[PDB]
Amino acid sequence: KVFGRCELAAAMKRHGLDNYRGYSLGNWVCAAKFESNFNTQATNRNTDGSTDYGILQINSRWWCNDGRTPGSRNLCNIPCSALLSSDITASVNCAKKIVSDGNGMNAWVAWRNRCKGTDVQAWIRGCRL
Ligand SMILES: [Au+3]
Ligand SMILES: [Au+3]
Ligand SMILES: [Au+3]
Ligand SMILES: [Au+3]
Ligand SMILES: [Au+3]
Ligand SMILES: [Au+3]
Ligand SMILES: [Au+3]
Ligand SMILES: [Au+3]
Description:
The chain has four helices and three strands; from the N terminus they run ααβββαα. It has helices at about 5-15, 25-35, 90-100, 110-115, and strands at about 45, 50-55, 60. The protein has a three-stranded antiparallel sheet with strand order 1-2-3. The structure holds gold 3+ ion (AU3) (8 copies). It is classed as hydrolase.
């Protein structure tokens, strides 16, 4: 599914991600925009053989099982395919675990390099929330 910007903000909010771990909803929307362009079916293979899945490009090295990432963990206890669903529940639930792991949203490289310290509220501007 390709979400609209306000549509994704509303979904993220319904699933409890707004101000989760202190991160305003604009931060989450900005991360999704640059991780996946709001496309739930986004995948990207890493040099190390792991893969990133979904709207927040969650990585199989730690967080999901895809059966093809040797020595990896599955800390969200889900198949990576579940992160590709039109319903973002699995991705939100896993993202909550990820952002609680210690380094906050810096776990998302694209967040650190393209969202952090910017005017992230712009990503929710004009949305009915
Ligand atoms: Au905001
Ligand atoms: Au893909
Ligand atoms: Au893989
Ligand atoms: Au894994
Ligand atoms: Au398997
Ligand atoms: Au594996
Ligand atoms: Au599985
Ligand atoms: Au923090």
